[PDB]
Design a protein around this nucleic acid. Structure first.
Ligand code: B12
Ligand code: SF4
Ligand code: SF4
Length: 379
RNA sequence: GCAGACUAUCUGC
C-alpha cells in the first residue's frame, strides 16, 4: 500500500526526468545539528544557510506530523558543446556548471510540484517542498536517503552521475520505508583537498566557506586582496574540487535540454559585461542561477578577471568606471585593476582620481593601484 | 517615461 505508492512515485519521478530518488524518515538530523554548531563556532559558515538550526534539523517542525522525506536529484551537464575561445583581445569569464542553463531552483521546483500533485491526487497527504532555499540541509537529506555519499570535497557524490547533480526534497506525512545510506568511495584520495586554490577544504568534508572561491564570487563588497589573484577568470561559482575528482571522470550527462549552456552567457566576453544595461543583464542572465545577486558581483569579478589577464585594452573602460560608476566597489576594484595590469601610462590618472574620489574605501583602492604601479614599474 | 542605486525604497533627467 505505502509500499505500492512508493513504487509508483519512483516510477513517475523517473518518467518526468528525475535522475535519482531516495527516501528517508522525518527524524531529526542529530549529527548535522552538532556539525552546524561546530562550523558556526569556527567561523566556517557562509551566511547563506538558514539561520535557525532547530528548523534545519527538525523536519517535523517544518511539516506538522511529518513521517518521511523524499529526496530527488537531477544530473546536469559538465561539458559545454562548442565553448568559444578566450583570446588575447577577446577575453572571457566563466560561470560554474551549476549556473548553466535554466536556474535549477525553477527546474527542480517544477518537478517537485508534479510529485506533490501526484500524491495529492491519491488521498489526506500533506507535503512541504524545497530546493536550496529551504531550511533543510539538502545534502544531509540526500545522504540519509541513499542518493549519494558525502565526499571529502563536501559534495554529495552519486555512483552514476558523480557530484554533478542538483538536489531537492519533499517532506511528507507518508510513512515511506527509508532507504540505506551508500558506501563512501573516496578511499585514500585527497585530490580535491590539494587542488583547492585557497585551501578552503580545511579537512575532509570540512569547508571554511569564507575562503571558498564559490562563496567569494557571490559577495557584494570588496574582495579581500589575497583572493584577487586566486579567482582567475571565474565570474560565479567554482568547480575545481569537482572537475579534479576521479569519481567525476567521464561524467557528462545531457538529460535535460533546458540545462544546456548558452556559451555566450555561460562563458561571456568580459568587456561588454562592464557596460551592460540592467535591461540587457536581466534579458541575458536573468534566468541563470548565477544572477541571483544581480550584476554587481559579476561585474566586480569581470574587472578582476581582466586584471588577471592583464588586458591593457580594458584600461580606458576601467578608467571610465573608476570615475563614473556610482558604486564604490566598482570604482575601487577598477582602480586596483588599472594598477594591477601594469601600464605605467595610467599612473598619472590614478593620482588624479585619488584627489577626486570621496569614498574612503574606493580612495584606498586607488592608493593600492598606485602602489601596484610603483612596485611593478621599478622591476 | 527613460536611466541608475539598493534590496518596495531612493536618486537623477
Ligand atoms: C551555504 C551553501 C554553500 C556555501 C557553503 C558550502 C558548504 N560546503 O557548506 C558556498 C557559498 C561556499 C557554496 C558553494 C557550493 N555549493 Co552550495 N549550498 C549551500 C546551501 C544553501 C547550504 C549548505 C550548508 O548548509 N552547509 C553547511 C554544512 C555544515 O552542511 P551541509 O554541507 O549542508 O551537509 C553536510 C555536512 O554537514 C556533513 N557533515 C555532517 N556531520 C558531519 C560530521 C563530520 C565529522 C564531517 C566531516 C562532516 C559532517 O554532511 C552533510 C551531508 O553531506 C546548500 C543548499 C541547502 N539548503 O542545503 C547548497 C548546496 C550545498 N550547494 C550546492 C552546490 C552545487 C555548490 C557548488 C558546487 C556551486 C559551485 N559550483 O560553485 C559549491 C561547492 C562548494 C563545496 N566544495 O562544498 C549543491 C550541492 C549538490 C551536491 N551534489 O552536493 C547544494 C545542495 C544546492 C542544491 N540543492 O543543489 N554553497
Ligand atoms: S569550490 Fe573552489 S574554492 Fe571552494 S572548496 Fe571547491 S575548489 Fe576550493
Ligand atoms: S577528489 Fe578524491 S577525495 Fe576529493 S571527492 Fe573526489 S574522490 Fe573524494
Amino acid at each position: 500500500n505505502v509500499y505500492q505508492l512508493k513504487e509508483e512515485l519512483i516510477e513517475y519521478a523517473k518518467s518526468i526526468g528525475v535522475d535519482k530518488i531516495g527516501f528517508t524518515t522525518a527524524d531529526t538530523f542529530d549529527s548535522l545539528k552538532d556539525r552546524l554548531i561546530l562550523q558556526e563556532s569556527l567561523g566556517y559558515l557562509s551566511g547563506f544557510e538558514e539561520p535557525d538550526i532547530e528548523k534545519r534539523v527538525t523536519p517535523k517542525l517544518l511539516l506538522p506530523k511529518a513521517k518521511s522525506i523524499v529526496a530527488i536529484a537531477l544530473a546536469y551537464p559538465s561539458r559545454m558543446k562548442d565553448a568559444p575561445r578566450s583570446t588575447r583581445t577577446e577575453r572571457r569569464g566563466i560561470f560554474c556548471r551549476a549556473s548553466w542553463g535554466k536556474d535549477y531552483h525553477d527546474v527542480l521546483r517544477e518537478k517537485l510540484d508534479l510529485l506533490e500533485d501526484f500524491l495529492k491526487s491519491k488521498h489526506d497527504i500533506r507535503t512541504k517542498s524545497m530546493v536550496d532555499t529551504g531550511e533543510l540541509s539538502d545534502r544531509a537529506v540526500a545522504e540519509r536517503a541513499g542518493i549519494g555519499f558525502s565526499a571529502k570535497n563536501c559534495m554529495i557524490t552519486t555512483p552514476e552521475y558523480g557530484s554533478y547533480v542538483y538536489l531537492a526534497e519533499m517532506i511528507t506525512n507518508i510513512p515511506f520505508e527509508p532507504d540505506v545510506p551508500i558506501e563512501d568511495m573516496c578511499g585514500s584520495c585527497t585530490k580535491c583537498l590539494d587542488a583547492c586554490p585557497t585551501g578552503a577544504l580545511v579537512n575532509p568534508g570540512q569547508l571554511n566557506a569564507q575562503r571558498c572561491i564559490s562563496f567569494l564570487t557571490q559577495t557584494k563588497g570588496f574582495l579581500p586582496d589575497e583572493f584577487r589573484t586566486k579567482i582567475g577568470n571565474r565570474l560565479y561559482g567554482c568547480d575545481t574540487c569537482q572537475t579534479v575528482c576521479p569519481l567525476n571522470k567521464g561524467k557528462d550527462f545531457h538529460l535535460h535540454p533546458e540545462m544546456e549552456p548558452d556559451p555566450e552567457i555561460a562563458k561571456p566576453l568580459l568587456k561588454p559585461l562592464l557596460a551592460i544595461s540592467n535591461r540587457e543583464f536581466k534579458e541575458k542572465f536573468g534566468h541563470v542561477s548565477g544572477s541571483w545577486r544581480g550584476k554587481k558581483p559579476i561585474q566586480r569579478n569581470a574587472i578582476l578577471a581582466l586584471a588577471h589577464f592583464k588586458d591593457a585594452s580594458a584600461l580606458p573602460e576601467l578608467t571610465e568606471l573608476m570615475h563614473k560608476d556610482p558604486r564604490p566597489v566598482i570604482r575601487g576594484t577598477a582602480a586596483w585593476a588599472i594598477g594591477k595590469i601594469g601600464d605605467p601610462a595610467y599612473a598619472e590618472e590614478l593620482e588624479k582620481a585619488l584627489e577626486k574620489e570621496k569614498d574612503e574605501e574606493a580612495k584606498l583602492e586607488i592608493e593600492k593601484g598606485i602602489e601596484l604601479l610603483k612596485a611593478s614599474g621599478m622591476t
